[PDB]
Design a protein around this ligand. Structure first.
Ligand SMILES: CC(C)[C@H](Nc1ncnc(N)c1Cl)c1ccc2c(c1)S(=O)(=O)CCC2
Length: 167
């Protein structure tokens, strides 16, 4: 958990302009969070980047989990191996508002982070999931009580999030 160069926003929420994959390699965190979908198909974006960094081992393990347990619910999670990136990967499904899922489930999604003391995570439901990223940060700050290190891979978005939170 050797996180470096983060800006502390609250007593338990930190943020950095960084690729979550690059952070996982440098930090070797106990838990890395994946911004998953309910069938754990890691086809692009954050999930695709994390899966590619495990040389597809995450996707094979995920298919085996789904075969035995069925899909997740929106707002839910599962703990699987972290492979070479972390001890564990916490796969969390935030709502995809571009597909009509309820934005209120973003609170349920962040609540899954409270079962782990320290996490490296992405900004849930941002990007192509369509949630307002400033709203996602506010729900993270209001809901997560354990120590969360957010990696946002876009300097422009990083700067807007820090400005909107320090207002
Ligand atoms: C807002 C983006 C800059 C951010 N991207 C990243 N943030 C950190 N490490 C990365 N490798 C990337 Cl790709 C982001 C955060 C959340 C989500 C996505 C994108 S998505 O479009 O893959 C859909 C699922 C939710």
């Amino acid at each position: 958990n050797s996180f470096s160069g983060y800006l502390k926003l609250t007593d338990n929420v930190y943020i950095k302009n960084a690729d979550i994959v690059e952070e996982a390699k440098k930090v070797k965190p106990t838990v890395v969070v994946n911004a998953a979908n309910v069938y754990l198909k890691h086809g692009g974006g954050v999930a695709g980047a994390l899966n590619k960094a495990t040389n597809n081992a995450m996707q094979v393990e995920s298919d085996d989990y789904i075969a035995t347990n069925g899909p997740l619910k929106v707002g839910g999670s599962c703990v699987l191996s972290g492979h070479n990136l972390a001890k564990h990967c916490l796969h969390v499904v935030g709502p995809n508002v571009n597909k009509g899922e309820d934005i209120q489930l973003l609170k349920s999604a962040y609540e899954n982070f409270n079962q782990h003391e320290v996490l490296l995570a992405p900004l849930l439901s941002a990007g192509i999931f369509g949630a307002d990223p400033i709203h996602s940060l506010r729900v993270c700050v209001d809901t997560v009580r354990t120590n969360v290190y957010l990696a946002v891979f876009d300097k422009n978005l990083y700067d807007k999030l820090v400005s909107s939170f320090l207002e």
